[PDB]
């Protein structure tokens, strides 16, 4: 049976980077001519596994971890990266194995009015665990004065938004991203 890489890569709806999703791929035989033998991806960096020999490499599960970031925010999506997305939104382990495929989506994710639908977490006390997910809307404490979960002095709203406009150069257009996480019945 073919694998649903099509259902995640060509997903009509993409989740935001603060509220990404994981899908388990247990029982399937893949055809990696859909990933490697194509040119829709602008970022390509496979870690620990090569871009061709991965076909005859069995792994106990594969995860398709999909989201949207900004143009230069793709460089934060790498084990160890200290970037804003890497440290407060979604962190890769330093011993990560897998592939990352990212592509520009300005024509579907950037509107002239400003796209405020895609968001990210600018405020996250401490740092996330490898593959940890946080969707909490609990009001960010900016200082030690009590905020009773309210907005005012020393009291800030935790969540912010992107504003994807067509006027941005290559640096900061929207990008649809997929991170593949492998875990030691899937082959090519």
């Amino acid at each position: 049976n073919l694998c649903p890489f099509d259902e995640v890569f060509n997903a009509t709806k993409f989740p935001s980077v603060y509220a990404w999703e994981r899908k388990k791929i247990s029982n399937c035989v893949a055809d990696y001519s859909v990933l490697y033998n194509f040119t829709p991806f602008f970022a390509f960096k496979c870690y620990g596994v090569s871009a061709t020999k991965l076909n005859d490499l069995c792994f106990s599960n594969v995860y398709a971890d999909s989201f949207v970031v900004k143009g230069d925010d793709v460089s934060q999506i790498a084990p160890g990266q200290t970037g804003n997305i890497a440290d407060y939104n979604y962190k890769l382990p330093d011993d990560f194995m897998g592939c990352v495929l990212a592509w520009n989506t300005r024509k579907i994710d950037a509107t002239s009015t400003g796209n405020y639908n895609y968001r990210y977490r600018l405020f996250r006390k401490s740092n996330l665990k490898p593959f940890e997910r946080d969707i909490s809307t609990e009001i960010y404490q900016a200082g030690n004065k009590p905020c009773n979960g309210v907005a005012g002095v020393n009291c800030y709203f935790p969540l912010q938004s992107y504003s994807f406009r067509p006027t941005y150069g290559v640096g900061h257009q929207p990008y649809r991203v997929v991170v593949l996480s492998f875990e030691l019945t899937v082959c090519g």
């Epitope: 200290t82 407060y88 200082g143």
Partner: antibody, heavy 119, light 107 residues
Framework: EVQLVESGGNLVQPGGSLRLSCEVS????????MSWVRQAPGQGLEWLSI???????FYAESVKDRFTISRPDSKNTLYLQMNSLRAEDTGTYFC?????????????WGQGTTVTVSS | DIQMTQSPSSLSASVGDRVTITCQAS??????LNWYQQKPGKAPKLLIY???NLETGVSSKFSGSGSGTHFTLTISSLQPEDIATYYC?????????FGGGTKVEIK
């Protein structure tokens, strides 16, 4: 009221050490965006470093590994343990408060503290 | 570190004249340009957030435009109280940086 307190600037030799202090009023350090930007007397602004609400740090390669912006959670203070000082490091030091959304405007800095580096 | 170059480096404008400053980024940084005013013997004070919005506690005479790689502030009427320098700043990348700034005096 929002207010900032710079202090700890004093005369020093090249290669020395110095320390800044700010018992933070108007906000508290423990969970804010805070930068460090110095200005030389009669020159442009110079970005040095920035600590994030979770403790993330960024440095330019010209000032990398020399400056250590850090903070204990036990006190309401941004610390800067400064090492390997040079004559070009003469401030007029300012710590910045980052606001929310695309408004990352560092609106409130303070008055600055006088660090002079000379033989 | 992103290089932000401004022009011109200094200019003289009469009482009530119009001062307009330009600031260019070497890479695209959207509306990510915090614009400050530094009066002589005073810290820089924020004027613009988002490249086109007036900062809170600033006079309505300051209203800018430009986004991406080029940024503009038109002081619709420079005043005797506005005798000061201005500094653009980008924050679009992991290393932040400031523009050279334009020293503005009264003529």
């Amino acid at each position: 009221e929002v207010q900032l307190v710079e202090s700890g600037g004093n005369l020093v030799q090249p290669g020395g050490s110095l320390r800044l202090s700010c018992e933070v009023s108007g906000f508290i350090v423990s969970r804010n965006y805070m930068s460090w930007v110095r200005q030389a007397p009669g020159q442009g602004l110079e970005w040095l470093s920035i600590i994030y609400p979770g403790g993330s740090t960024f440095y330019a390669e010209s000032v990398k590994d020399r400056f250590t912006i850090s903070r204990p959670d036990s006190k309401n203070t941004l610390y800067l343990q400064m090492n390997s000082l040079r004559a070009e490091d003469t401030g007029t030091y300012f710590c910045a408060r980052g606001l929310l959304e695309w408004r990352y405007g560092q609106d409130v800095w303070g008055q600055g503290t006088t660090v002079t580096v000379s033989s | 570190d992103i290089q932000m170059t401004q022009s011109p480096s200094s200019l003289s404008a009469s009482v009530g004249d119009r001062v307009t400053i330009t600031c260019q980024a070497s890479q695209d940084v959207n509306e990510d340009l915090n614009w400050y005013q530094q009066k002589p013997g005073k810290a820089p004070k924020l004027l613009i957030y988002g490249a086109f919005n007036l900062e809170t506690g600033v006079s309505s005479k300051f209203s800018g435009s430009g986004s991406g790689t080029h940024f503009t502030l038109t002081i619709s009427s420079l005043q005797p109280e506005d005798i000061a320098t201005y500094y653009c700043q980008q924050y679009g990348h992991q290393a932040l940086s400031f523009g050279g700034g334009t020293k503005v005096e009264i003529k």
